[PDB]
């Protein structure tokens, strides 16, 4: 079905950069107006991601996929990776989602 | 000996179930009070959108049985779309109905039950999109009289 | 009734002529598009009767009625005969059907 | 672990706790899906061109025989990159119910199984699918009554 | 990038009036790497262990009379023992009783499948046959078939 | 006056029921077109896997009765596996069939019925695994003619 | 497979039909062209000859090849199912299609 | 029987601690990759229990048994708890399950 996020469930080591990729399967969404949502494990409020250096958008326009990077994984690193995109055709405007959980021991 | 007056219209389709057919959902258009014109094609129980635009989709199914066995029966009715842009079948309109919660009748002279389901909505469709109306249990179809099972789109 | 064939139960002699008439009641159907279908005992194939020779079809647009005289009555042609016509008004085109059975037995042949 | 690996193989079994649908499972005791065969959308993806053996069994059970006159079918299909149309490779049909629902001495559970098997030449990326028309008579209450698999010979 | 070993999968011809004739020149069917189809028979081209399988689907448009017994057998006549012997066999009664009495016909379907591993030698003749080829349902997709593969 | 000409290697077995087994399912290999070689054992009507690897399991059983005494008859046929890792009998392949749908000579005579059942699948077996083909009613077996009942494995 | 172009024809005596079939399987080639006429209403089947006046406009780009038929009276009316032999590896087969012409 | 939950029906009081033990019978499943899932009474969606805080886990690979001690028990934490393990030998990878239900009664509040 639509939107297949590659790292769905990840278990990484303290200090290890985990890369999160989302691959679009609906050929109507654009990888240019990409959005990222994190919900840190244990909270029930969805926060946004400010991509400022540590989170790099290694978007691949060929595969209609976008990527995100973390660095020096911490020990409090707990959060569910959710990606979104602002698809747009003629009239209709919608968004699409994926799925992803992170665990750091 | 017949004639025709001014059509002047747009894509339309209204197909009806085959009355003399066994347990299957086969759509017919070459029957009284049925339409399939102005580019809409019926390929394989599917409507082919001839031009991009907004369409109205509708369908009705009537389920009838002459007794309720105990097996938890769920009656479903869905209109789906497979698009050229996103080639996965997704539901646009759906409905579910439980025909009988009543304990398996140990004796009622069969108790004939009737349950209908109607679906309708407006959607944006693209060129080459294939719409499909289906039901889960084709053994309870009541295609005896007419207008009891049908399926159609109309270009608004 | 969207076309009605008049003879329902027919009893003919070994080798004779059965006449089946169908009358158009829908003014959307044209007498310029005739088709015929017959059935055989226990058989499941809808066959198309051809117009020529032993199968004669007469069309008169005034009453919008057509008939089918069949001669040389073989007894293996015992079954339910239906008629058909092509109707089309505006954006719609459809066809209509009927129903009616024929039964014929044989004779003694005088093989003494 | 003491043994080596081999050639593309798959043996998937129906989900017992999915009453109402035919979901193929591979992460269950005595089931296999390895060496390139992918399970995408209830479909097996051929990993390499060659000759494969495809098989599937389904067991149908119903309570009493109603007077609906149902036809039970079971088919294995192949949609190839070479011919992008659904074509059936193996098929079988069975009519289980002739007589009407007993009006005296009722509840008559009937059991009818169906088995399919054959060898075919498949190409890379071909998606194989085993399906049935009436998934409401499935008897997955016991182990290995419904299954589907391929193995490259 | 080739493939090898004797293989065969023949399907009945739908245009075969009341008979079980095996065909090979159709989409999803194979017969290569030495297997010959002679007189409705498969000829093993090399000695080894082969996998033999076949299915036939029986259809009738009503219960005719008494009890008809449907059988389907794969037989083998070898060069070492020149008699046709049955390798795999199955019997099935398609009609239980209540021959249609006035009430309309009720088409019944009964399939039968056979399969096993056997040692075949050069020149052996395998044949799949059924007793009532008048109830054959060879309509469209592979409902009846017969094949071998060199394991 | 004997010899051999081909080697062959794959552990294999194809055993057939004993015709001189009046009321039981005893598997035999010393019959014309039957095989059991390259290490496979048959301990107490059970096949013993000689090496770990991928095997193909198949079996057919044919049931015959000369009349239906009571609607309540269930024909079952299952192939079991006991592994060294999990010492409990688990079903690998199973099938059930009902030969008699009511009736029970209410207006008929001794109506001989025949019902076959076939089982097949591929499994990963380890050394020492004991496979067993069993049936619930050993009195309806029809092994009177030929290859109607059998059971076998082959290492692919 | 096979996409034979003259689906329904009821031309009049004296016309000319070009009969093209389009291949959908990448195993079938526009190399093995052939047609199987029916000669009015027969209970068997016949064939039809090629190589000269009954030549085609075979075009592999559209995967269609033609059948030039002139002076149609009543012997040039029948079912011209189309056929081609497809081959990828160890498989060898042929495929059929469909298309009829009628001249009154 | 490929994983055995010992406490099937338990009745503890709000403020107590129940231990559920699971013992492995397949020597291919490992005591390292164990998982627990609960289904809250009256709901159908099965939720996944998280490792931290109230859920302390004792694992012993020697006897191939793992447990899940639940502390600070409330009355809203009554449901069917299952244990799980990941098995892998050759080309096969599968999982195994159990079953066991808990019912918690409350303790009221002495109102003078």
Neighbours of chain F (3+ CB pairs under 8 A): D, E, H
Chain D residues whose beta carbon lies within 8 Å of the beta carbon of residue F120:
55, 57, 115, 117
Give the closest residue to B73 by CA, choosing from B19, B134, B115, B109. B115
The distance from CA A94 to its chain's CA centroid, rounded to whole angstroms, is 17
Contact H104, H14 (CB under 8 A): yes
D92: its two tokens: 């079988």
Give the gap in angstroms from C-alpha B25 to the nearest C-alpha of chain D. Answer: 12
Nearest residue of chain D to residue E3 (CA atoms): D50
For C1, name the nearest residue in chain B, comparing CA atoms only: B32
Within 13 A of A35's CA, how many CA atoms are on the CB side? 14
CB pair distance less than 8 Å for G24 and D83: yes
CA distance E118 to F34: 7
Residues of E within 8 A of D123 (CB-CB) are none
Cα separation, B2 vs C24, whole angstroms: 11
Residues 6 or more apart in contact with residue C112 via CB below 8 angstroms: none
Residues 6+ apart with CB under 8 A from B129: B48, B49, B81, B82, B83, B84
Distance of residue C44 Cα from the nearest chain E Cα, in angstroms? 9
F146·E119 Cβ contact <8 A? no
Q: Which two tokens stand for residue A98?
A: 């994926």
Nearest to D135 by CA among D42, D37, D3, D55: D42
| φ/ψ bin of F4: left (φ > 0), alpha (ψ from -120 to 50), beta (otherwise) | beta
Gaps in chain F after residue (C–N beyond 2.5 Å): none
Neighboring chain A residues of B86 at a CB cutoff of 8 Å: 2, 25-28
Query: In this structure, are strands A93-97 and B113-125 parallel, antiparallel, or unpaired?
Result: unpaired
Q: How far apart are the first and last CA of chain A?
A: 32
Measured distance CA(D134)–CA(B137) in Å, rounded: 8
Experimental determination technique: X-ray
Are B99 and B68 a contacting pair, CB within 8 Å? yes
F98/D60 Cα distance (integer angstroms): 11
> Residue F23 and residue F117: Cα distance in Å, rounded?
19
CA dist C47 and B47 (Å) reads: 30
Structure's resolution in angstroms: 3.4
Closest CA to B126 of B93, B94, B87: B87
- The length of chain C in residues reads 112
On whether any CB of chain A is under 8 Å from the CB of B86, the answer is: yes
Pairing of strands G78-79, G100-101: antiparallel
Residues of B in contact with C88 (CB under 8 A): 2, 4
Q: Are G94 and G85 in contact (CB under 8 A)?
A: yes
* Chains adjacent to G (≥3 CB pairs closer than 8 angstroms): D, E
Instruction: Look at B139 and D70 and tell me if their CB atoms are within 8 Å.
Output: yes
Alpha carbon of B98 to those of B71, B76, B101: distances in Å? 11, 9, 7
Among the listed residues A8, A2, A30, the one whose alpha carbon sits nearest the alpha carbon of residue A82? A8
Task: Give CA–CA dist F144/F136, Å, rounded.
Answer: 19
| Residue contact G1–D121, C-beta within 8 A | no
CB pairs below 8 Å between D and F: how many? 87
H35-47 b/e (C-beta count within 10 Å ≥ 16 → b): ebbbeeeeeeeee
* H91 with D28: Cβ contact below 8 A: no
Across-strand partners of D93?
Answer: D73
Are G55 and G49 within 8 A, CB to CB? no
- Beta-carbon contacts below 8 Å between B and C: 40
Alpha carbons C66 and C25: distance in angstroms, whole number? 12
SS3 C4: strand
DSSP characters for chain B?
-----------EEEEEE-TT--SS--EE-SSTT-EEETT-EESSSEEE--SSEEEEEEEEEEEEES---SS---EEEEEEEE-SSS-S-EEEEEEEE----S---SSSTT--EEEEEEEEEEEEE-TT-EEEEEES-TTSB--SSSSSSEEEEEE-
**E150 contacts E142 by C-beta, under 8 angstroms:** no
Planar angle of CA E117, E118, E119, nearest 5 degrees: 140
Secondary structure E strands in chain C: 4-5, 9-12, 18-23, 29-38, 47-48, 55-60, 65-70, 81-89, 92-96, 101-104
Report the distance separating Cα G81 and Cα G48, nearest Å.
Answer: 11
- Angle at E131 (CA atoms; ends E126, E132), nearest 5 degrees: 130
Please tell me which residue of chain A has the smallest CA distance to B90. Answer: A1
Sign of CA dihedral B94, B99, B104, B109: negative
Please, do chains D and E touch (3+ CB pairs < 8 Å)?
Answer: yes
State which residue of chain G sits closest to E32, comparing Cα positions.
G90
Tokens of B109: 């002279």
Nearest to E59 by CA among E146, E149, E143: E143
């Amino acid at each position: 079905a639509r939107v297949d996020q590659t790292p769905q469930t990840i278990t990484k080591e303290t200090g290890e950069s985990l890369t999160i990729n989302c691959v679009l399967r609906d050929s109507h969404c654009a990888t240019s107006s990409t959005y990222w949502y994190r919900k840190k494990s244990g909270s029930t409020n969805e926060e946004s991601i400010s991509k400022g250096g540590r989170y790099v958008e290694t978007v691949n326009s060929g595969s209609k996929s976008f990527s995100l990077r973390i660095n020096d994984l911490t020990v409090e690193d707990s959060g569910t990776y959710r990606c979104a995109s602002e698809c747009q055709y003629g009239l209709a405007e919608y968004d699409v989602y994926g799925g992803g959980t992170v665990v750091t021991v | 000996r017949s004639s025709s007056r001014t059509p002047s219209d747009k894509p339309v389709a209204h197909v009806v179930a085959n009355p003399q057919a066994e347990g299957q959902l086969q759509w017919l258009n070459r029957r009284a009070n049925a339409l399939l014109a102005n580019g809409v094609e019926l390929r394989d129980n599917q409507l082919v959108v001839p031009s991009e635009g907004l369409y109205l989709i509708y369908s009705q199914v009537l389920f009838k049985g002459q007794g309720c066995p105990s097996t938890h029966v769920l009656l479903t009715h869905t209109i789906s779309r497979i698009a050229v842009s996103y080639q996965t079948k997704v539901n646009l309109l759906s409905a579910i109905k439980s025909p009988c919660q009543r304990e398996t009748p140990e004796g009622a002279e069969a108790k004939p039950w009737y349950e209908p389901i109607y679906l309708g909505g407006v959607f944006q469709l693209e060129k080459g999109d294939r719409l499909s109306a289906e039901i889960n249990r084709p053994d309870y179809l009541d295609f005896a009289e007419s207008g009891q099972v049908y399926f159609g789109i109309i270009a608004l």
